[PDB]
Design a binder for this molecule. Structure first.
Ligand SMILES: [Cl-]
Ligand SMILES: [Mg+2]
Length: 209
Protein backbone atom coordinates (compact mmCIF):
# COMPACT_ATOMS: atom_id res chain seq x y z
CA UNK A 1 0.00 0.00 0.00
CA UNK A 2 2.85 2.28 0.91
CA UNK A 3 6.60 2.21 1.17
CA UNK A 4 8.31 -0.50 3.26
CA UNK A 5 11.79 -0.33 4.73
CA UNK A 6 14.41 -2.56 3.08
CA UNK A 7 16.76 -2.35 6.06
CA UNK A 8 17.80 -5.81 7.30
CA UNK A 9 16.70 -7.02 10.72
CA UNK A 10 19.47 -8.52 12.90
CA UNK A 11 18.97 -10.24 16.25
CA UNK A 12 21.83 -11.07 18.62
CA UNK A 13 21.60 -13.67 21.39
CA UNK A 14 24.81 -13.53 23.36
CA UNK A 15 26.08 -15.01 26.59
CA UNK A 16 27.77 -12.55 28.96
CA UNK A 17 30.36 -14.22 31.22
CA UNK A 18 33.18 -15.78 29.21
CA UNK A 19 31.74 -14.48 25.91
CA UNK A 20 31.50 -10.71 26.29
CA UNK A 21 33.93 -10.93 29.26
CA UNK A 22 36.98 -13.12 29.34
CA UNK A 23 36.04 -15.20 32.38
CA UNK A 24 33.52 -17.99 32.66
CA UNK A 25 30.46 -17.42 34.83
CA UNK A 26 31.45 -20.17 37.25
CA UNK A 27 34.80 -18.40 37.63
CA UNK A 28 33.15 -14.98 38.21
CA UNK A 29 30.27 -15.05 40.69
CA UNK A 30 32.06 -16.69 43.67
CA UNK A 31 35.12 -14.41 43.53
CA UNK A 32 35.74 -11.92 46.33
CA UNK A 33 35.13 -9.02 43.93
CA UNK A 34 31.72 -10.23 42.78
CA UNK A 35 30.72 -11.13 46.35
CA UNK A 36 31.80 -7.64 47.57
CA UNK A 37 29.04 -6.18 45.37
CA UNK A 38 26.30 -7.93 47.44
CA UNK A 39 24.67 -6.36 50.48
CA UNK A 40 25.96 -7.85 53.70
CA UNK A 41 29.32 -8.84 52.19
CA UNK A 42 31.80 -10.27 54.70
CA UNK A 43 35.25 -11.22 53.42
CA UNK A 44 35.70 -14.94 52.63
CA UNK A 45 31.98 -15.58 53.22
CA UNK A 46 29.87 -16.68 50.24
CA UNK A 47 26.29 -15.49 49.76
CA UNK A 48 23.79 -16.67 47.13
CA UNK A 49 25.14 -14.80 44.12
CA UNK A 50 21.81 -14.58 42.28
CA UNK A 51 19.23 -13.68 44.94
CA UNK A 52 21.14 -11.62 47.51
CA UNK A 53 20.29 -7.91 47.10
CA UNK A 54 23.09 -6.03 45.38
CA UNK A 55 24.72 -2.89 46.74
CA UNK A 56 23.28 0.23 45.12
CA UNK A 57 24.67 1.19 41.68
CA UNK A 58 26.60 4.20 42.99
CA UNK A 59 28.53 2.02 45.46
CA UNK A 60 28.99 -0.71 42.82
CA UNK A 61 30.65 1.90 40.61
CA UNK A 62 32.92 2.95 43.51
CA UNK A 63 33.93 -0.70 43.98
CA UNK A 64 34.75 -1.11 40.26
CA UNK A 65 36.79 2.10 40.34
CA UNK A 66 38.84 1.01 43.33
CA UNK A 67 39.52 -2.36 41.68
CA UNK A 68 40.37 -1.26 38.16
CA UNK A 69 41.08 2.49 38.26
CA UNK A 70 39.15 5.01 36.19
CA UNK A 71 38.05 3.61 32.82
CA UNK A 72 39.67 6.28 30.73
CA UNK A 73 42.69 7.11 28.58
CA UNK A 74 44.99 6.12 31.49
CA UNK A 75 43.34 2.70 31.91
CA UNK A 76 45.73 -0.22 32.52
CA UNK A 77 44.69 -2.90 30.03
CA UNK A 78 47.33 -5.28 31.44
CA UNK A 79 46.37 -5.16 35.11
CA UNK A 80 45.37 -8.26 37.03
CA UNK A 81 41.77 -9.48 36.62
CA UNK A 82 41.16 -7.36 33.51
CA UNK A 83 39.55 -10.51 32.05
CA UNK A 84 36.47 -9.90 34.23
CA UNK A 85 35.68 -6.87 32.07
CA UNK A 86 34.51 -6.68 28.48
CA UNK A 87 37.41 -6.69 26.07
CA UNK A 88 38.07 -3.45 24.12
CA UNK A 89 36.95 -5.22 20.92
CA UNK A 90 33.68 -6.19 22.57
CA UNK A 91 33.19 -2.62 23.89
CA UNK A 92 33.62 -1.22 20.36
CA UNK A 93 31.15 -3.81 19.07
CA UNK A 94 28.45 -2.88 21.56
CA UNK A 95 28.94 0.90 21.10
CA UNK A 96 28.17 0.34 17.40
CA UNK A 97 25.22 -2.04 17.61
CA UNK A 98 23.62 -0.18 20.57
CA UNK A 99 22.80 2.61 18.08
CA UNK A 100 21.88 0.65 14.96
CA UNK A 101 18.24 0.26 15.87
CA UNK A 102 17.70 -2.46 13.25
CA UNK A 103 19.99 -4.59 15.47
CA UNK A 104 18.36 -6.06 18.60
CA UNK A 105 20.73 -7.19 21.39
CA UNK A 106 19.63 -9.92 23.83
CA UNK A 107 21.97 -11.07 26.61
CA UNK A 108 21.04 -14.57 27.78
CA UNK A 109 22.65 -15.31 31.08
CA UNK A 110 22.73 -17.10 34.43
CA UNK A 111 24.20 -13.88 35.84
CA UNK A 112 21.94 -10.94 36.81
CA UNK A 113 20.94 -7.68 35.18
CA UNK A 114 22.19 -5.42 37.99
CA UNK A 115 25.75 -6.79 37.61
CA UNK A 116 25.87 -6.63 33.81
CA UNK A 117 24.50 -3.07 33.87
CA UNK A 118 27.21 -2.15 36.37
CA UNK A 119 29.91 -3.58 34.08
CA UNK A 120 28.54 -1.68 31.08
CA UNK A 121 28.17 1.47 33.17
CA UNK A 122 31.74 1.17 34.48
CA UNK A 123 33.16 0.72 30.95
CA UNK A 124 31.61 3.92 29.65
CA UNK A 125 28.15 3.08 28.30
CA UNK A 126 25.34 5.61 28.77
CA UNK A 127 21.99 4.94 30.43
CA UNK A 128 20.33 5.18 27.02
CA UNK A 129 22.67 2.59 25.51
CA UNK A 130 22.18 0.16 28.42
CA UNK A 131 18.40 0.55 28.07
CA UNK A 132 18.65 -0.91 24.55
CA UNK A 133 19.93 -4.20 26.02
CA UNK A 134 17.44 -6.94 26.77
CA UNK A 135 18.75 -9.16 29.58
CA UNK A 136 17.18 -12.62 29.85
CA UNK A 137 18.33 -14.10 33.12
CA UNK A 138 16.12 -17.03 34.05
CA UNK A 139 19.07 -19.37 33.46
CA UNK A 140 16.99 -21.54 31.07
CA UNK A 141 18.46 -20.46 27.75
CA UNK A 142 16.25 -22.49 25.41
CA UNK A 143 13.12 -21.14 27.12
CA UNK A 144 14.40 -17.54 27.17
CA UNK A 145 15.42 -17.54 23.49
CA UNK A 146 12.24 -19.38 22.42
CA UNK A 147 10.11 -16.87 24.32
CA UNK A 148 11.96 -13.88 22.87
CA UNK A 149 11.39 -15.18 19.29
CA UNK A 150 7.65 -15.76 19.56
CA UNK A 151 6.04 -13.45 16.95
CA UNK A 152 8.69 -9.93 11.27
CA UNK A 153 11.43 -12.45 10.34
CA UNK A 154 15.05 -11.64 11.13
CA UNK A 155 17.52 -11.50 8.26
CA UNK A 156 20.39 -12.72 10.46
CA UNK A 157 20.46 -14.20 13.96
CA UNK A 158 23.70 -14.24 15.98
CA UNK A 159 24.31 -16.87 18.69
CA UNK A 160 27.43 -16.56 20.89
CA UNK A 161 28.21 -18.67 23.95
CA UNK A 162 31.40 -20.09 25.51
CA UNK A 163 29.51 -23.00 27.09
CA UNK A 164 28.95 -25.87 24.59
CA UNK A 165 25.69 -27.00 26.19
CA UNK A 166 24.19 -23.49 26.60
CA UNK A 167 25.20 -22.65 23.04
CA UNK A 168 23.39 -25.82 21.88
CA UNK A 169 20.30 -24.82 23.87
CA UNK A 170 20.17 -21.41 22.17
CA UNK A 171 20.76 -22.88 18.73
CA UNK A 172 17.94 -25.42 19.20
CA UNK A 173 15.61 -22.56 20.07
CA UNK A 174 16.55 -20.55 16.97
CA UNK A 175 16.27 -23.52 14.60
CA UNK A 176 12.97 -24.44 16.27
CA UNK A 177 11.60 -21.10 15.14
CA UNK A 178 12.36 -21.84 11.48
CA UNK A 179 15.68 -20.03 10.95
CA UNK A 180 17.88 -21.82 8.39
CA UNK A 181 21.66 -21.97 7.97
CA UNK A 182 21.90 -18.88 5.75
CA UNK A 183 20.28 -16.79 8.52
CA UNK A 184 22.22 -18.18 11.52
CA UNK A 185 25.75 -17.12 12.58
CA UNK A 186 26.67 -19.20 15.63
CA UNK A 187 29.97 -18.88 17.49
CA UNK A 188 30.99 -21.36 20.20
CA UNK A 189 34.43 -20.13 21.35
CA UNK A 190 36.50 -20.43 24.53
CA UNK A 191 36.70 -17.30 26.75
CA UNK A 192 38.83 -14.64 25.12
CA UNK A 193 38.71 -16.28 21.68
CA UNK A 194 35.68 -14.52 20.16
CA UNK A 195 36.35 -12.32 17.14
CA UNK A 196 34.34 -9.28 18.15
CA UNK A 197 36.01 -6.99 15.63
CA UNK A 198 35.16 -9.33 12.76
CA UNK A 199 31.55 -9.66 13.91
CA UNK A 200 31.38 -5.85 13.94
CA UNK A 201 32.41 -5.64 10.29
CA UNK A 202 30.05 -8.49 9.33
CA UNK A 203 27.19 -6.58 10.95
CA UNK A 204 28.17 -3.25 9.36
CA UNK A 205 28.35 -4.95 5.96
CA UNK A 206 24.66 -5.92 6.05
CA UNK A 207 23.73 -2.23 6.07
CA UNK A 208 24.34 0.51 3.52
CA UNK A 209 27.41 2.67 4.17
CL1 LIG B 1 25.21 -18.33 31.48
MG1 LIG C 1 29.56 -18.04 29.62
Amino acid sequence: TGYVSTMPKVIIFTDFDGTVTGKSGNETVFTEFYQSLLQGYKKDVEQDYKNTPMKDPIEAQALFEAKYGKYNENFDHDQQDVDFLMSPEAVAFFHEVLKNDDVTVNIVTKNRAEYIKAVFKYQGFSDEEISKLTILESGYKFNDVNSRLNHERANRVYILDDSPTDYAEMLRAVKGKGYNEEEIRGYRKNPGEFEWSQYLEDVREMFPP
